[PDB]
Symmetry: C7
Subunit: 223 residues, 7 copies
């Protein structure tokens, strides 16, 4: 389709060949060549940017790929997520978890940090608890029961980092940092462990009479 | 219309021809040519930017189009949304859902991620529930009834990813992550499924006596 | 007025002519020409930017105008709004709705998305409702009465997109997405329809005993 | 004052003249000229920026001034406000409403939108009302009384845009958009009209028993 | 101290002289000169930036100083405040009100707006009042008593701008814009006037029974 | 695999060799060489940026490494954290605490501040207390008991900085700045000390009857 | 260690020497030299930036150091704080108050404001009080008692700036600006004075029956 389009590509090529042959035949004068000549390199230079660089930068990715099709590639910087679909020079298909294919320009991968959880070894499960000041005396023991359970639980990696401590003193709460790592990377398996853990842990704070806490205030009144 | 306008286009062309002929005839001296000559390439170089690059970058889009007229093209980066209308070198018409035609310069597509949900396979329906701590013991069973229903429902894709779990422990709530995918991409059909699902799910939490929850506080008072 | 001003314009012109004639007469030595010569093109190059580019970029706008005097031109990016007044190379007058004339430099139009609602086909009326959880069982029917009315109403375009659904589950509410399009673009006519619609709709939620909702909380107290 | 200062300006000038004369006399060799020569144009080129461009860009302002001494020049972009004081090439004095003279570099005017309300035709008076849901049935009539008054009032321009409508449905309120334009631009006159209008309008909502509204909540309690 | 340091400065100078003399003596071949030669100008060009520009830009400041030692120089843009201490080419000492000397690079003054309140003519005293809706009928008179007092007060400049009006309708309040200018620039004198004014004004709202207002709400409850 | 790929690398190399040999054989004319010639250096120049610079900048890191494999490298600027994994020219592997390997481009290390807590000497434990105004008279003594304990405690470094003071007056509280340093850098050991300290400190405020505080308000009511 | 590494540094040096000797021997043709030649200067030019500039900019710091080892150097701009450790060309060690050594690239010091409180003359102690509207009549006297004490106190510098005034009218409070300067810069001494001052001041507001204030509201209720 489209005459003018197909035409004008021949055109911007042919005249690079014409200037070349004209300064080799006549071009009297030689002087004006170099000059005209420079606007091509400079204008292509400031019209170039990413639109040209995508190909080099894509090739650099071709020498080695930090991400490899079968992985999802969160980036803290730019907002791109979900599994890497297919790799191409001008673009890079990438399915998101909403199954919409975002076409990422390749030059972006040149700059941003590009962690891929797809190559995970583990899933960190991080939580927080938070027990009323009323529960304050019993903090030492409740923490310990929770500390003990995680070791004995099958799902979590005992060898891996496993800290539970009074930690923060924050706000209206007494937040307690659960921090431990699950085995399986895979989504349903880890989530299921997490549910099992919160169900167990939730009971323990219930079990000793320490009560879970919500933001709370101190109203003052007149008579 | 307009003499000065029509005039001044002849002008910036004719003098490119005059410099060319002058350095071929006289121009004595040759030396001053190259020099004058360079301000053209440099000034066009720093007056060029996007205003020149739009055409190259549009052509690059002409070699392949990630978006293809019949689609809407959300971009997480820049704020442009709604169906792609017509494609042009200096611009790109694009109807928004408010039916206002935003004329996007083409150079922008060179940089930003440009997912198009128009080429969706599915609609993810993501929700959250959130049940009082009062409902805490019954969490395991309510979750399961909800877990069971989604599988049996006709609208959702059972084969596709389908997670429901206790997940977060957040705030004054016990948020539960519904996450499943509908069949039809199309707007009224999916929304109707969503309404059917929330109506069903809303009943289940009602049905077991677990109560939906709102932000809550702990007032303290004097006598 | 002003000698020094009028003087110094002659000056920065005349010496471009003097350098030209001096290197054609003497300038011995030729060597130092090219060199001096380059600081002009480079300094004009890095003192140029927008201050020079406004004219090219304005001309590009002269070849075709996405906005055409009789229209108002919101831009999601830069903060400029209101009807386009008059178009000029260094600037572009533009009345705002507060009737203050903002003089927009033309180079800006080169980059930002420039939707103009002035070329609207419709006005989307988007609302939200939000009914207490108390109203929860009756959600299916209230929605339907509202769904029915919009079709029958004369003001809205029935052919055009028209969705009403339970949609969100958010917060302390049960928000319901009204979404439909009015005929007339023009400001008083559409607003009047909107008032008629909200007055009608407001009654319906009132009519079935479902109550409109406001942020709500759950106070807890001591004895 | 200051020998070293006065000295070193002669110095960076004289040696531009020495290099010029040296390559015209000896400079054996010619080759090294051009080279040394280029660091001047390039270093002045990347040490130049705004510090050089202020003068060109100021001159461009001298060809035409969108702002003209007797006016105040808000800019949505950069934070500069208040009456324009005096215009100068390196700077531009500008009194602010706190009577502190901010010296704006001229290059800034090259980029930012520079509306000047000083050349206003009118003052838009925009308000909002907001009536309890309790007042909901009477909304149609209260609006009309308010609608009627503005037309009859002497201060507002009846010919000019004049919309009052139920508009928003927002939050805990029923906000009503007053929007009309005063005659006089000048500060005390318009403000006085505004006071007269709010005093009149405030009564009307009072007059029909509709009550003005404040953020409100729905406390829930135990026994 | 330090041989290697003192040594390596001689070094990067001497070899600029060696290349110059070598291409004037031998350098067979001339061709490679210009080339090597260019990396110096370009690398100094992209290693230059501010680190070189500070001196030019400082000199520009030396031709005229908008700020003059004995003044404090708030900038809306960059965060620098407090009295200007001493002026130097690479830097500019500047005491802050916390008496910590921040060394500002001079190039910054090239770009940012640099108002100096030190050259003030006045101090604007801006306040806000805000009277319960309960006080609403009496707004006209309370405002007037306040309006009258400011004129009669010795401290404020009566000739200078002096507006008091109902202004805003905002929130839970009825905010009233006091706006007037004090005589003395100097810190203790103006503050003392401000205290005298607020003490006087505070009484007037007290005096008519209008009550000052705080954010307020509308609790709703069950039985 | 892939013919076109393997092919096109030969191609962009071979023609650099062809242009070189062609201008050495024919190339008639010499003039057009330099010109064509420049577009290569300029286009590689504006397609280069980081994609080329990563290697130089990586080498600079190779001369000396502020971070050394066995350390974690928080950066206040860019969001990268966790232990440094392996170092490579195009990238730098880096495990995060979630065990996901983020591949950092090396050029980034050139700009951002890169503190590594891995080379810590200590752990600062910073807290805050905050005692009701009710506790106000006893502030001097409670502070002292807390001041005394930290000195006597084995875990904290007494020699190191150790301030405890009334400090802030903020909000509804009387915040007290605990600030002291633990011995062991290592994660479980320090956290355990922190738990021991907060448990001890929590008792002291309890012990004197001063009560810990939460945000509090002053309700006002009608009859 | 590492053959390939050690090898490839020889390599990128040796071929700069080979091109030089080749165009001096053959290089037939001379023409292609200059051209190839330029890609080196340009690519080093756009791969250079900070990675090259760190050394120049470090040297500039070597000519004079605004910060001098024994000082801590807060910067309002970039987030770097704490005592300056050691100074080096590629970097600058700097201990933070958490005793983690952040390695700052030197080029940063070229741009940002770099106040160093280490060279303080004083410590400003700034506070705020805030007394219920209930305390309003007594504001004049309480302020004066506080005004008097600071003069008589030994710790504060009476000669130095010393303002106390009703100042703000803000919010639910009547905030009073204490502002005075302590003698000793050093951390424990000044903090101790601050504690002594707040303890004294706290009593005075207590002493006259004015009560310290917290955010407060006005609940409204039904029957």
């Amino acid at each position: 389709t489209s005459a003018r389009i197909m035409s004008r590509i021949i055109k911007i090529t042919i005249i690079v060949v014409l200037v070349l042959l004209y300064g080799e035949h006549f071009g009297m004068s030689l002087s004006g060549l170099l000059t005209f000549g420079g606007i091509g390199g400079l204008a292509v230079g400031m019209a170039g940017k990413d639109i040209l660089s995508n190909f080099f930068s894509g090739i650099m990715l071709y020498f080695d790929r930090p991400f490899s099709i079968g992985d999802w590639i969160r980036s803290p910087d730019r907002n791109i997520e979900g599994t890497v679909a297919e790799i191409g020079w001008r673009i890079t298909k990438i399915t998101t978890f909403d199954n919409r294919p975002l076409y990422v320009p390749n030059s972006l991968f040149s700059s941003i940090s590009v962690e891929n959880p797809g190559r995970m070894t583990n899933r960190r499960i991080t939580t927080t608890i938070g027990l009323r000041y009323e529960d304050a005396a019993k903090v030492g023991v409740i923490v310990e029961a929770v500390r003990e359970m995680l070791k004995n639980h099958p799902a979590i990696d005992q060898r891996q980092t496993l800290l539970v401590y009074f930690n923060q003193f924050a706000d209206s709460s007494l937040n307690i940092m659960v921090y431990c790592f699950t085995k399986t990377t895979v989504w349903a398996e880890w989530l299921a462990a997490q549910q099992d853990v919160y169900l167990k842990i939730i009971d323990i704070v219930q079990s000793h009479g320490a009560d879970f806490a919500f933001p709370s205030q101190t109203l003052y009144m007149d008579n």
